RNA sequence: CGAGGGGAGCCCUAGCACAGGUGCUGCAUGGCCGUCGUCAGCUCGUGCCGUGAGGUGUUGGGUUAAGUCCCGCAACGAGCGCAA
């Protein structure tokens, strides 16, 4: 169940352009291909489940960034049914570091959106 | 008993405190004026890069008289300026 679709077809993305810190995962080339690994995907993926479960049941606002091209439509739907904040189009320049200015822009958003009722 | 000690202030016969330069110095100052310029630029808070001056905001594309304001972009935004 948790390893069927992960093992069905999950290979082939941007080949012969690869940062060689990923080199311990590709195990076979046949003609011009580079295979994304499966068994280490299961183990590191399981470590990620047991990390975000134990870290996230306390009530952490676990944010996720899907700004590439086509994870925008999946982040934009899964974020409302998830209950956690998100980002739509691009990462804002210094979103966490300039949270004073961005958060006081949200403080402006708390009173500009109340103008519609008046 | 005022035209007697004189009396509120003033006047002086002539004094005396201090005043007095359309002469330099804006190469000691405050207010100023002209100037580039009615072109569209100049700064600040936060955060990043860089040992640093500093850059990033204020870069690239589009167009307007215009830093007027959109897309991406480590930038998000404010103040004086084109306006009202
Ligand atoms: Mg400048
Ligand atoms: Mg600069
Ligand atoms: Mg720009
Ligand atoms: Mg102009
Ligand atoms: Mg402006």
**How far in angstroms lies nucleotide B67's C1' from the CA of residue A111?**
28
Method: cryo-EM
DSSP A22: G
Which residue, chain included where needed, has tokens 């086509």?
Answer: A70
Quick check: A97 CB within 7 A of strand B? yes
DSSP A102: H
d(C-alpha A14, C-alpha A82), whole Å: 30
Which residue, chain included where needed, has tokens 């958060």?
Answer: A103
A85: buried, middle or exposed (CB in 10 Å: 19+, 13-18, 0-12)?
Answer: exposed
Handedness of CA A71, A77, A81, A85 (dihedral sign): positive
Nearest nt to the A88 alpha carbon by C1': B72
Coil/strand/helix, residue A19: coil
Resolution in A for the shown PDB structure?
A: 3.8
**How far in angstroms lies nucleotide B40's C1' from the CA of residue A5?**
60
Q: Which helix (H) or strand (E) holds A116?
A: none
DSSP A115: G
């Amino acid at each position: 169940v948790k390893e069927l679709l992960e093992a069905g077809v999950h290979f082939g993305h941007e080949r012969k352009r690869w940062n060689p810190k990923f080199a311990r995962y590709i195990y076979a080339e046949r003609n011009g291909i580079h295979i994304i690994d499966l068994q280490k995907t299961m183990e590191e993926l399981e470590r990620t489940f047991r990390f975000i479960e134990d870290l996230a049941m306390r009530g952490g606002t676990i944010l996720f960034v899907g700004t590439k091209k086509q994870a925008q439509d999946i982040v934009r739907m899964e974020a409302e049914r998830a209950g956690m904040p998100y980002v739509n189009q691009r990462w804002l320049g210094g979103m966490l570091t300039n949270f004073k200015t961005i958060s006081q822009r949200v403080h402006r958003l708390e009173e500009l959106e109340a103008l519609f009722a008046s």
